[PDB]
Amino acid sequence: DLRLHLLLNTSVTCNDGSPAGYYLKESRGSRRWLLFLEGGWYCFNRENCDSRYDTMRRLMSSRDWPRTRTGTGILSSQPEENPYWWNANMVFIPYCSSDVWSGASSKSEKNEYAFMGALIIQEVVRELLGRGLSGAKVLLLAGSSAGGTGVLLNVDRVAEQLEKLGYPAIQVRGLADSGWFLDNKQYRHTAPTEAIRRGIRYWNGVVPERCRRQFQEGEEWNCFFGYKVYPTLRSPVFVVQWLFDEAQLTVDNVHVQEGLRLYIQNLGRELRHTLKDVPASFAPACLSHEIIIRSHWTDVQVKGTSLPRALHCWDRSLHPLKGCPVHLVDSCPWPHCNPSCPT
Ligand SMILES: C#CCOc1ccccc1CCCCCC(=O)O
Ligand SMILES: *[C@@H]1O[C@H](CO)[C@@H](O)[C@H](O)[C@H]1NC(C)=O
Prior knowledge:
9 helices, binds 6-(2-prop-2-ynoxyphenyl)hexanoic acid, 10-stranded mixed β-sheet, 29% helix, binds 2-acetamido-2-deoxy-beta-D-glucopyranose, EC 3.1.1.98, two-stranded parallel sheet
């Protein structure tokens, strides 16, 4: 079990002003630290944040959080469930800022909600250093769905924070799961680009510095899309992305005749193309959503290699490897053409 710690700096808050926090399970002797960012969509104005507060309140407040959480998948300490990092120090950072981990805005008389995701990560890292993180050799910042996009938005800031704090030996890396989206045409029209554009203004959202300087003022929404922000990043980032992500299909209004068949096949081809120059990636041809904290995340394979093995091969590459690949992207063009896809 991972044990809850609310942030000692109580000015770093969830949406409703309650303290943010993290769940921790230490592993003495291990110098690996895994900080996992939870996902869960987002909200982009007062009205729809109010709706989220009614029925998704745990994603906006810590007042009802449980004292413990079971580590599952890559957060599991059992080697059978987690062949990759079962002996690592485990951190689960709840997503209670509804801002894709980009905000740096306090609740005040002008703001009904605080959007502090980017500051929450920084404060967790800061407080963890006093609990053993100072002795780390590797800090893997991982995350799923909105948490996976959050990895892309925050990994370089974490590396910069530790550098300026005097810990240049800690290697910061990223693992972005199901957070790699396309700003594509909808299958049936009425969208992420505008909701994200409105979100950033609403959250005072921040994006990585090099990407911000490329796209410049008003266009920072571009940096929420993996294939645009990833080439600007200096930290190593491993990208896990279903070719037919359910969240991608949802926003594309896809729920089979030729038009939809072509739309789906093109979506997979486009995703494949964006990963062509991502050297550490795992991208199966499945219709699914999230993987790395699922208990059976060991089951899926691309070209015969599981995701836990691909991540271990990535670790070895950061010391091509014979029989230890790190770039694993399915080429078949339809969901479940890969036989190991989840049922
Ligand atoms: C296309 C699309 C989805 O829109 C986004 C685009 C770019 C970055 C982030 C998002 C939202 C991520 C939500 C994922 C679902 C979840 O968090 O469970
Ligand atoms: C608490 O967090 C805020 C927001 O990041 C920061 O400005 C302030 O310096 C922090 N205070 C302490 C004592 O860490």
